[PDB]
Structures are given as structure tokens and as C-alpha cells.
Amino acid sequence: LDKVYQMKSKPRGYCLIINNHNFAKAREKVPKLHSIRDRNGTHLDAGALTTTFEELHFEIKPHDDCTVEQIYEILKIYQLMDHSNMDCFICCILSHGDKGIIYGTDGQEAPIYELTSQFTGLKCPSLAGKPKVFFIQACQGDNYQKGIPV
Amino acid sequence: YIPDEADFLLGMATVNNCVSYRNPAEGTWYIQSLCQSLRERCPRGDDILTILTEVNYEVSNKDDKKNMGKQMPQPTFTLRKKLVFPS
């Protein structure tokens, strides 16, 4: 039997939801994103994540339309805070993205690794030994994943 | 002691280089599948990797017919234990 992460604290931990919908800033500020679209429907993801993780006893921490700097600042708080009484940390990023990065609504890039690395045992010892879960709902490029018959 | 980067689960909606899909009316393939799976399987005590596998399965079955497009979520993990989200 594998060990199982303790998952009994109430709440289990924070489920941060960075929910990026409005990319007007990106469109204004980043030439290559001039036509990047708002992420209509993302609210439904946020809602789904919220209800799902509430059910799982996470304290949902939504942040809408975060520029990259705001994302880092929000994440910093979670990175810095004391999760000792938490059993888990979940961060959902719903945004546009490209290879390895997610976009702030300002069209700035946040390398996913830059995000997740904020929660290493060193960065966030109170989460040491505790599951840190990041769900990244973003493109990771503009390629269409091809389908193959099976 | 455990590694600095232990106990991470990264649930990517898509493998690198590729789009992930968002239905403005329903949410994203990935997140919706994830939540569906979590809601359905966590009470069953299914661990997250099993769930993400199901997500992979589910999302893999979705099609962007216009572009003959697929989406392949891709979890990466350094979880050292089963990650379950119990009641």
C-alpha cells in the first residue's frame, strides 16, 4: 500500500483559483497578444473548481483577472503563509498560456514552474510533505493536438 | 527529509505546444472533466492520479472537430503518497 497524504484538516487547505477572463490588457499591452481573446466560460471553471473543492473541504480563494504581477503577489501570500494546519494546497490557474507559461490578463507571462516552485518545501515549509496541487487550465501553445484513430 | 520538490501534482490541461479548449458555455475541457472526476471519484476514495488518468481519458475523447483538434492533459507529479480528497 502506498502511503496516503493526510487529508483530514478542515479546511484541507486553500484552493487558490486564479481565474483569468479579461485579456483586454494583454491585447493592449502585448503586441503578440493583440488578438488574444477573453476566456469566456472560465467563470464556469472557477465555479466548478470552487464547488468541487469546497466539497473536498478546501477553502476556495478565487482571484479573477490577475495580471502576472498580481498572480505572483497572490501566490507569494500563499507561499509565505503558514499552512501548518492545512493538509494540502491547491492552485488552479485558468488563463491563456503558451509553452510552459500562463498569461496574466496583462499578457505578461508567468512560467508555470515559476508558479509551482513557489511552494517547494523550502519556499513553503508549512506545506512540506503535503500535496501541492496545481491545475493549469491554459493553452501551452497554439498547436492543435492531433487526433489519431484507435 | 524529503525532496524540496516532492509532493507536487501539476495537472496540465494540455501537453506542451498545444491549445487546451474552453467552451464558453461549459468551461474548459480539462477543468470540467477534472471537477466531474473529482466530484465523482473522490467520494469513492480514488486518488488524484487515478482521477487525472480519468481526466486524461475523458479529455482525450473530446474533439475540436473544426481543427481536427484534440487535447491531451498531462499531469506531472512528485507525489510520494496517494493523494485522496476524502470527506
Partner: peptide, 4 residues
């Protein structure tokens, strides 16, 4: 359907 849209892409992120």
C-alpha cells in the same frame, strides 16, 4: 469552442 475556444482555445486558451
Amino acid at each position: 469552442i475556444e482555445t486558451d
